[PDB]
Design an enzyme around this catalytic site. Sequence first.
Site, PDB file in Angstrom:
ATOM      1  N   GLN A  44       5.812 -11.991   9.775  1.00 24.22           N
ATOM      2  CA  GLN A  44       4.873 -11.379  10.891  1.00 24.22           C
ATOM      3  C   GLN A  44       5.145 -11.746  12.373  1.00 24.22           C
ATOM      4  O   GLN A  44       5.593 -10.995  13.082  1.00 24.22           O
ATOM      5  CB  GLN A  44       4.154 -10.707  10.025  1.00 24.22           C
ATOM      6  CG  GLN A  44       3.809  -9.579   9.277  1.00 24.22           C
ATOM      7  CD  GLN A  44       2.720  -9.557   8.024  1.00 24.22           C
ATOM      8  OE1 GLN A  44       1.852 -10.863   7.808  1.00 24.22           O
ATOM      9  NE2 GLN A  44       2.211  -8.720   6.809  1.00 24.22           N
ATOM     10  N   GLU A  95       7.505 -15.395  -1.160  1.00 20.89           N
ATOM     11  CA  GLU A  95       7.967 -13.889  -1.339  1.00 20.89           C
ATOM     12  C   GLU A  95       8.623 -13.461  -1.258  1.00 20.89           C
ATOM     13  O   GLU A  95       9.437 -13.341  -0.065  1.00 20.89           O
ATOM     14  CB  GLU A  95       6.227 -13.823  -0.567  1.00 20.89           C
ATOM     15  CG  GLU A  95       5.028 -14.231  -1.264  1.00 20.89           C
ATOM     16  CD  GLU A  95       3.970 -14.058   0.106  1.00 20.89           C
ATOM     17  OE1 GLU A  95       4.295 -13.826   1.175  1.00 20.89           O
ATOM     18  OE2 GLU A  95       2.733 -14.054  -0.601  1.00 20.89           O
ATOM     19  N   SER A 148      -0.262 -20.465   8.243  1.00 26.92           N
ATOM     20  CA  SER A 148      -0.972 -19.434   8.211  1.00 26.92           C
ATOM     21  C   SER A 148      -2.016 -20.789   7.356  1.00 26.92           C
ATOM     22  O   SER A 148      -1.363 -21.386   6.535  1.00 26.92           O
ATOM     23  CB  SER A 148      -1.615 -18.631   8.212  1.00 26.92           C
ATOM     24  OG  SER A 148      -0.855 -18.274   6.576  1.00 26.92           O
ATOM     25  N   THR A 183      -9.725 -13.231   3.969  1.00 28.27           N
ATOM     26  CA  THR A 183      -9.293 -12.539   3.289  1.00 28.27           C
ATOM     27  C   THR A 183      -9.562 -13.483   2.060  1.00 28.27           C
ATOM     28  O   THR A 183      -9.432 -12.362   0.853  1.00 28.27           O
ATOM     29  CB  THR A 183      -7.159 -13.017   3.268  1.00 28.27           C
ATOM     30  OG1 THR A 183      -7.318 -12.228   4.712  1.00 28.27           O
ATOM     31  CG2 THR A 183      -6.858 -12.293   1.976  1.00 28.27           C
ATOM     32  N   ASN A 233      -7.799 -15.204  13.600  1.00 26.32           N
ATOM     33  CA  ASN A 233      -7.967 -12.990  13.610  1.00 26.32           C
ATOM     34  C   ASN A 233      -9.687 -12.120  14.541  1.00 26.32           C
ATOM     35  O   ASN A 233      -9.150 -11.334  15.580  1.00 26.32           O
ATOM     36  CB  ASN A 233      -7.958 -12.668  12.357  1.00 26.32           C
ATOM     37  CG  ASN A 233      -6.498 -13.056  12.336  1.00 26.32           C
ATOM     38  OD1 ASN A 233      -5.567 -12.736  12.816  1.00 26.32           O
ATOM     39  ND2 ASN A 233      -6.435 -14.038  11.052  1.00 26.32           N
ATOM     40  N   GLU A 261       6.065 -32.314  29.231  1.00 28.29           N
ATOM     41  CA  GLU A 261       5.252 -32.503  29.863  1.00 28.29           C
ATOM     42  C   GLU A 261       4.248 -31.819  29.851  1.00 28.29           C
ATOM     43  O   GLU A 261       2.948 -33.184  30.224  1.00 28.29           O
ATOM     44  CB  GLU A 261       5.738 -31.996  31.038  1.00 28.29           C
ATOM     45  CG  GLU A 261       7.042 -32.107  32.541  1.00 28.29           C
ATOM     46  CD  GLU A 261       7.302 -31.780  33.291  1.00 28.29           C
ATOM     47  OE1 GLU A 261       5.876 -30.618  34.088  1.00 28.29           O
ATOM     48  OE2 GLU A 261       8.219 -32.097  34.351  1.00 28.29           O
TER      49      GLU A 261
HETATM   50  N1  GTP Z   1      -3.741 -14.183  12.868  1.00 28.41           N
HETATM   51  C1  GTP Z   1      -2.752 -13.711  11.768  1.00 28.41           C
HETATM   52  N2  GTP Z   1      -3.433 -14.014  11.006  1.00 28.41           N
HETATM   53  C2  GTP Z   1      -2.351 -13.306   9.772  1.00 28.41           C
HETATM   54  C3  GTP Z   1      -1.400 -12.245   9.414  1.00 28.41           C
HETATM   55  N3  GTP Z   1      -0.872 -11.547   8.900  1.00 28.41           N
HETATM   56  C4  GTP Z   1      -1.616 -12.529   7.798  1.00 28.41           C
HETATM   57  N4  GTP Z   1      -2.812 -13.905   8.470  1.00 28.41           N
HETATM   58  C5  GTP Z   1      -2.959 -14.994   7.408  1.00 28.41           C
HETATM   59  O1  GTP Z   1      -2.143 -15.349   6.432  1.00 28.41           O
HETATM   60  C6  GTP Z   1      -3.416 -15.787   5.219  1.00 28.41           C
HETATM   61  C7  GTP Z   1      -2.866 -14.920   3.935  1.00 28.41           C
HETATM   62  O2  GTP Z   1      -1.609 -15.511   3.550  1.00 28.41           O
HETATM   63  P1  GTP Z   1       0.079 -14.767   4.015  1.00 28.41           P
HETATM   64  O3  GTP Z   1      -0.086 -14.847   4.899  1.00 28.41           O
HETATM   65  O4  GTP Z   1      -0.606 -12.982   3.413  1.00 28.41           O
HETATM   66  O5  GTP Z   1       0.932 -14.969   2.454  1.00 28.41           O
HETATM   67  P2  GTP Z   1       1.309 -17.004   2.269  1.00 28.41           P
HETATM   68  O6  GTP Z   1       1.081 -17.321   3.786  1.00 28.41           O
HETATM   69  O7  GTP Z   1       2.931 -16.854   2.165  1.00 28.41           O
HETATM   70  O8  GTP Z   1       0.733 -17.678   1.227  1.00 28.41           O
HETATM   71  P3  GTP Z   1       1.095 -17.347   0.499  1.00 28.41           P
HETATM   72  O9  GTP Z   1       0.045 -15.099  -0.002  1.00 28.41           O
HETATM   73  O10 GTP Z   1       0.257 -17.947  -1.432  1.00 28.41           O
HETATM   74  O11 GTP Z   1       1.818 -16.886  -0.470  1.00 28.41           O
HETATM   75  C8  GTP Z   1      -4.767 -14.356   5.775  1.00 28.41           C
HETATM   76  O12 GTP Z   1      -5.824 -15.760   5.495  1.00 28.41           O
HETATM   77  C9  GTP Z   1      -4.430 -14.189   6.798  1.00 28.41           C
HETATM   78  O13 GTP Z   1      -5.152 -14.956   8.478  1.00 28.41           O
HETATM   79  C10 GTP Z   1      -1.532 -11.806  11.015  1.00 28.41           C
HETATM   80  O14 GTP Z   1      -0.613 -10.673  11.032  1.00 28.41           O
HETATM   81  N5  GTP Z   1      -2.496 -12.675  12.315  1.00 28.41           N
HETATM   82 MG    MG Z   2       2.079 -14.974   1.000  1.00 29.03          MG
END
Ligand code: GTP
Ligand code: MG
Lengths: 66, 438, 431, 428, 436
Positions: free
Chosen positions: C15, C63, C132, C171, C198, C246
């Site tokens: 994303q 995924e 993340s 989450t 976030n 740098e």
């Molecule tokens: N800052 C920020 N964090 C995000 C965003 N979208 C998802 N996250 C983070 O992603 C975490 C959850 O994991 P995901 O990214 O949804 O999925 P994943 O990292 O592939 O891990 P799995 O679900 O186990 O496959 C949440 O705790 C969020 O903090 C976003 O748009 N901005």
């Molecule tokens: Mg995921």
Amino acid sequence: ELAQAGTPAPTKPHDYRQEQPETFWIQRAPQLPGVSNIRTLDTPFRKNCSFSTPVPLSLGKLLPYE
Amino acid sequence: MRECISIHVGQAGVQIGNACWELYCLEHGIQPDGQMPSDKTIGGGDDSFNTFFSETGAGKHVPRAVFVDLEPTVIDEVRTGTYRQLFHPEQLITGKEDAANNYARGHYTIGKEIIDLVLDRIRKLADQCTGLQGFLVFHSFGGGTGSGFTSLLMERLSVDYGKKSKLEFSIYPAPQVSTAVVEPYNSILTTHTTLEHSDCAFMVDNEAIYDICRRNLDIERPTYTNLNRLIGQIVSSITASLRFDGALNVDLTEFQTNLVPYPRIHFPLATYAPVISAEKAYHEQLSVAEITNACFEPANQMVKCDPRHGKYMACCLLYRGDVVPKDVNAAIATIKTKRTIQFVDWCPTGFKVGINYQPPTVVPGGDLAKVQRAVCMLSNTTAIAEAWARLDHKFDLMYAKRAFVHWYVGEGMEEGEFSEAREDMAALEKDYEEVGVD
Amino acid sequence: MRECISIHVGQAGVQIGNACWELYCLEHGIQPDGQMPDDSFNTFFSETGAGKHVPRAVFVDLEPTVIDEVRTGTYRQLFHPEQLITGKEDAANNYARGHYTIGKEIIDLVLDRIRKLADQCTGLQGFLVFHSFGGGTGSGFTSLLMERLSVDYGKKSKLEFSIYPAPQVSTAVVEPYNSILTTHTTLEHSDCAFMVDNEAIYDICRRNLDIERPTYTNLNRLIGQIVSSITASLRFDGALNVDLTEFQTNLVPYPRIHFPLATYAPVISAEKAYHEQLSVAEITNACFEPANQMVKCDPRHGKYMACCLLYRGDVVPKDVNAAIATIKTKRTIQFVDWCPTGFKVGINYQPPTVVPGGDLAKVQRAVCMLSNTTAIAEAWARLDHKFDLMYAKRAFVHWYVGEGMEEGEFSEAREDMAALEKDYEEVGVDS
Amino acid sequence: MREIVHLQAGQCGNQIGAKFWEVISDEHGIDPTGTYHGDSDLQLERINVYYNEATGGKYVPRAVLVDLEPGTMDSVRSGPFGQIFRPDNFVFGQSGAGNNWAKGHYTEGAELVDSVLDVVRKEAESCDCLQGFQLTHSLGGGTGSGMGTLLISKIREEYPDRIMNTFSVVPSPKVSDTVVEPYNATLSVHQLVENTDETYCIDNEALYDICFRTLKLTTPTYGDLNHLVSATMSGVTTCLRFPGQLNADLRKLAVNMVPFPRLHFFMPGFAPLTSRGSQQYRALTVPELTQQMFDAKNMMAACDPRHGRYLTVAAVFRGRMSMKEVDEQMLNVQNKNSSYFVEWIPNNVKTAVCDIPPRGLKMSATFIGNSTAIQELFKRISEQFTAMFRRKAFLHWYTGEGMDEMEFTEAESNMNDLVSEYQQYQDA
Amino acid sequence: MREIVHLQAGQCGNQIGAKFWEVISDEHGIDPTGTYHGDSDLQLERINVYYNEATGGKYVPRAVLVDLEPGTMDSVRSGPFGQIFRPDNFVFGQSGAGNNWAKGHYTEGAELVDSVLDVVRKEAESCDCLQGFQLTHSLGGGTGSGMGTLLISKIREEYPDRIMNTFSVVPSPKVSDTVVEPYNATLSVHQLVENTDETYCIDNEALYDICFRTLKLTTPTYGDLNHLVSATMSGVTTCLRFPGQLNADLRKLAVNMVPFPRLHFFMPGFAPLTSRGSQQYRALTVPELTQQMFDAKNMMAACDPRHGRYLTVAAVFRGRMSMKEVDEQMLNVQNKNSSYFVEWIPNNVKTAVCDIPPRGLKMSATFIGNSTAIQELFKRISEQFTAMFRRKAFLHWYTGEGMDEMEFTEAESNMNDLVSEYQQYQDATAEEEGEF
Ligand SMILES: Nc1nc2c(ncn2[C@@H]2O[C@H](COP(=O)(O)OP(=O)(O)OP(=O)(O)O)[C@@H](O)[C@H]2O)c(=O)[nH]1
Ligand SMILES: [Mg+2]
Ligand SMILES: Nc1nc2c(ncn2[C@@H]2O[C@H](COP(=O)(O)OP(=O)(O)OP(=O)(O)O)[C@@H](O)[C@H]2O)c(=O)[nH]1
Ligand SMILES: Nc1nc2c(ncn2[C@@H]2O[C@H](COP(=O)(O)OP(=O)(O)O)[C@@H](O)[C@H]2O)c(=O)[nH]1
Ligand SMILES: Nc1nc2c(ncn2[C@@H]2O[C@H](COP(=O)(O)OP(=O)(O)O)[C@@H](O)[C@H]2O)c(=O)[nH]1
Ligand SMILES: [Mg+2]
């Protein structure tokens, strides 16, 4: 959003399975070291052995510069 | 003058020959009728077809190839299909009954009946040719005719023609998948006719083409037509140095000098690059440095063996298209710096380079893309020793309980062939480990 | 000549990658076909024998439910089909599943694809890693991807833009296990690492941009603006350009500390853009306000160790030096006693570009700051409190032991966190 | 005949040289293409001091550009006066230092010196009688300081009996825009004090102070700063090119301004600086030049000689003028301030006069000053170095690249001995 | 009156020779048909050096082209300037050598040399006063080094009181494209050291290096590499064909260079080479030629003279020019570089000046340098041959053609004696006399 231009227009007609790609060699085909006699309209890189065959074992061909 | 006689023995040989001779006709402008639309009145300077076709006063160009098989059911497709007027009627030699997955049946019993007709047609092609480069053999290990009748064919060719080159294109059995049961017997009894009676021998197995045409050419379920297009593309690339004019020319005996360090070791590794679909040719940058690494990548190999656990002994590179000598030396250089691959310590410069001007052609209905650059590589590697030992284990596992031996003993051969063909193969594997010692 | 191969892992990585690469295409004038309607694009886009520009990015996820709308949406013809690597059966918010069980089947495909993009670089500055801390693939798979990249490539730069879990809202429930078990393994296998949180960006969009109902997409556009300003000096010329190395060498006093904070200013709506005076003094005064911070921690409790400023647009070096001078006198800010001059100044010429449907407006000058601060311990010390509270009764531990990892990995990660905190305080201790 | 080989190191060295070749090509009448387009014959009489001869009556500068990053090289070649340079003179490395002195001096600068010493030997042997060299570099970044000290260290033994000048951009406390900048300054002054005939200290604080107080420009860009410093750098070698009533080449300045071999740190100034509003109202008169020069605001360093003693003083004047007023005013400023000069050197003044003025100006002056006030600068660098080295800050970027800890200790001790040497002339 | 008979061996020799006849026919003003279309009268005063008169005012070259593969002979026939050659002189076989030195020297090339020596004798006896022969070939092939060295041995026995030049393409380690190069190389160096008067080492690395960083050339095709090779070989014998103030042919060059008959491996170099973006920024003057001639960039071998000592050197200048600067500049580089020049021999620089410049240039120069730094190539060939012959690799391709294993051992001993022979002269005390 907004307007996107399409694919660029072809300046010359193109058709695969018959067309030879533009290469450095085909650009300088009469000026290269290693290129034989040029008597073919398809590719100038098809071998000619008119000069190379002996006087026996030869069909009547055309010698280069003759 | 330079020219090669290609023989196709077996059901695999005929089906490889169909997909490779349709490439040769399109490369030289030959119709299925045999006539050449070009050179209608004048323009006979073109003699690039002289390596594969014979000119006749009616304009017909007949191939200098023979099709040998013991079952008529696959050779009658050629006599009926769209190439029924191109081939000579007597160059499609047809038996009566097949060997039926049996070495002894096709070597000692049925293979002694049509041997005289095949050796007659070879002599007619050998008397017609004026300067012969070598013989090309297309056959498969697993079949009865492709192992049995082929084994007697190389011994009779060695007695007749002594110094002629003999190249081999063998369909080695795949390690996990296959199509028969007695393949370990047929593949281990043919080791003698590929050891002393073959000047060069390129091994290919079907599953290492299967994964290549699945993950690179992005088509979900290929078939045997798509395998034989990639197999026949290498033979055109090898013989492109004879046919089409180039900066560096490589004869048939040119790369035999640079890839056969010892007479016992004549098993190179064939690979081809690029193999991409028309979808990916729009996306991926295609360059000289980016196609010389696809040959070295073990996932794009055509034999299920990993050169990372082996070590390279010699290499031969053949280029097609606009490959200037500047980027050849730039790309060979970075190959030598990377330490993932390994070279033997007794071969300091292991590369042979050939450059041809004419780019490869495509076929209508084909799956490869129309590109400007191509490369095929023939490399000697110790990783054939792990390829033999995997089938060597299956043969010893089958032979311990003495299965299917009554099918071989009753045809006319002794039971000492199994122990002897096991022993000299073991000595050949003992040979490969010793050469690999630094 | 210069190149920067980005890698995106996790659903947050995909994303962020969509928002980052939309900004890159509109900034360089790229159609989503990849066509041009000058070599500044060469650091991110690879030229092709068809005239197309293919991005130097690798998308990784377990995924298939987020890669497909990348393969179906507007940029379905831009990305090469083999750059979007997709596994199966997910990771289910588990470090053990993403590291030891599921991550080991696709790691060879990623490293083979990285080699096929790292053969094209005559000179490569370094990889950028977006992930993340919470989810399984962003935690488990990134942990051993860093180890294999460190073995394969010797001293290439490794930048991180990680998403640290928020202290209040999040989450998952097993996110302390996922966050701690990567902080232990990103010490010796990362060159630099920024953190974004976030709920602070939620506070930013609430009280500055006048958007009271944002999504991840309005969040992700702000991270894309930060990453653009980081590589802005690489892509375009400026008065004092700055490379990746740098500010990588001007922000680490010691090898154990490589955790700066990234802020952005201005971030204001279009109605407030008409009113406010956007001078370089008025944009550097907003980076020091804790209300405009991006990580939920106050530098007033901490000390500034090193700082880096990235000015973008109609900036003057004369007024920049004046704005630095007036900051250095006030006592709200406090530097350490062993660093009399902690500033690094970078100036770029080209003003930032906006995207339609965004939140920002036409701005003539902007600044992005990377300040290393003694305020981040309260984020780790509270996470030490959250993890040990939930490890006390060994909750959710059988979900990690069942894949093949030893119980002792939890205990040694606690000694690593304690040692990192005891490494940390003596630098804050004055002479 | 007497020829000067120019050296440019780093981004600052490239920017200061592009403006310098811009202002003296206009002084000698050279178009952007390179062809001579003049109005007199005195301009063409001495061209070989800075230019070479080419085909078709073209002149290419006797300069070499050195950088470790091609980004600044492209802007120099794409500038207004980037066509005049030969493309062989540009030397660039594909990996920079990154404000690090260790990269430029030990690892990365070691490979790049083989090309520069090839190029600089290639064109210095073409001189019939090489007069000397010249370097411009900045101490605030490791691209032109780590290797800039190594270029000095390699050229010294190769060409011993020469003279070389360096223009060092000595870093400032308020315009300190890099953190590791005291490390770059201290480790380069150690190499500068032992292998240099003549050194110049130019500071961006003084350049900003001049353009604020005197020129009244609202936006002092780096082009205005390069204009101010190159108006002095052209002004110091005027006797070589333009004949005058009393000539003084760079060696004649050095013998009267260096009394001891470790005392060669001079700080310059330029006299006729005027705003546009004040341009109409000033009067071009000889005491106006020396009164606007000996004003302490007009100097080009972050130090004040009021805190120190004027050891030796040099003045170079431009313009056809009477020299009795030159001798009268400089005696007057020497006798009226009897506490700012040392007692043990009478007649602390070296004087030179050139007939040809700078273009668009009537009269001008340039001043070179050796004073004890430079030790205020060196102590300011050393106090920040010892306040940050003692906690081993940023040491892993230096001890891991092939440098032991003893180089930092000897760099402090040599600088401690140098300020003690300068201090003993403040009292005695 | 002083005729040079040209000899071409192998595919590499024909590509070099075709460009060489193109570059000097333009110099003498000859159309591809064969007649003369020029503007000066001194171009026909001395033209029998390389050309032979035919009927109707036609000039044909005094060259013979020899190969073991007929593919190259048709290419050099149907090339841009292949019509001028007499078709009798194209001698060729039908089966190639196969990158094998044993085939070209013992079995395949032993039958082709009867036809070649009849043509060579027929063309050399027609000269009123034969000056000498000249051969261009490559040591990395089978039909150039296998059979070219056999042509060396037969000609030297038949014509002893004649001078023979060769232009050997010494193999290269970094851009090697053939595995069996050290096999073909070390079996031919012994033939070149015993039966050859002058040898010039031309290397493909230096041709690539000059074409990359000096010419700033985009695509260095083999025609561009042979453009540099034909430069020195046209300029080395320009005092034979054109009058000058100080004339010196290749025999006078041979006397002043070779102190002992085992020391004849030289290094060529062409002085006035500029790029397109830097030519109009450079003045053409005698010091500019001397600086560009003596640096290690323009040397046409893989030898750095910094590691060795310059033994004896040449400069052959071209153009109407005042030779104070010729007599002064090489004295200046003699006095400065005291260590590079051996002090055992004083004022080793040989000077020649030719009045007529090359077409379109007003000034030019050519360099021949005898140095001890040539011994690093033979040592590199020795170590690559030692490391592979010890394992008996690729030996059945050579020992199956009749030659035993002691020919390799004596080939090692002859080259190891050669590299030691250069080593004594590099480190020798001038101010001493021995037992003799
Ligand atoms: N800052 C920020 N964090 C995000 C965003 N979208 C998802 N996250 C983070 O992603 C975490 C959850 O994991 P995901 O990214 O949804 O999925 P994943 O990292 O592939 O891990 P799995 O679900 O186990 O496959 C949440 O705790 C969020 O903090 C976003 O748009 N901005
Ligand atoms: Mg995921
Ligand atoms: N690569 C490839 N292999 C083929 C193809 N067709 C058949 N084969 C091989 O042929 C083998 C089957 O045995 P065959 O060669 O057909 O047997 P045969 O030569 O006809 O001998 P008999 O059947 O006993 O009379 C399989 O193992 C395949 O590997 C083909 O189109 N492509
Ligand atoms: N006076 C002056 N100072 C400059 C100029 N350009 C840069 N600087 C100073 O030099 C420092 C940065 O120099 P840098 O580019 O790192 O030098 P380099 O490392 O040798 O390339 C900054 O602090 C600037 O204040 C200039 O044109 N004039
Ligand atoms: N300089 C130069 N080298 C060449 C040319 N043609 C081929 N070569 C080199 O010669 C080597 C191969 O020589 P080869 O053709 O086998 O020699 P032959 O068998 O005697 O004809 C290659 O490594 C090439 O680099 C040329 O025109 N010029
Ligand atoms: Mg069958």
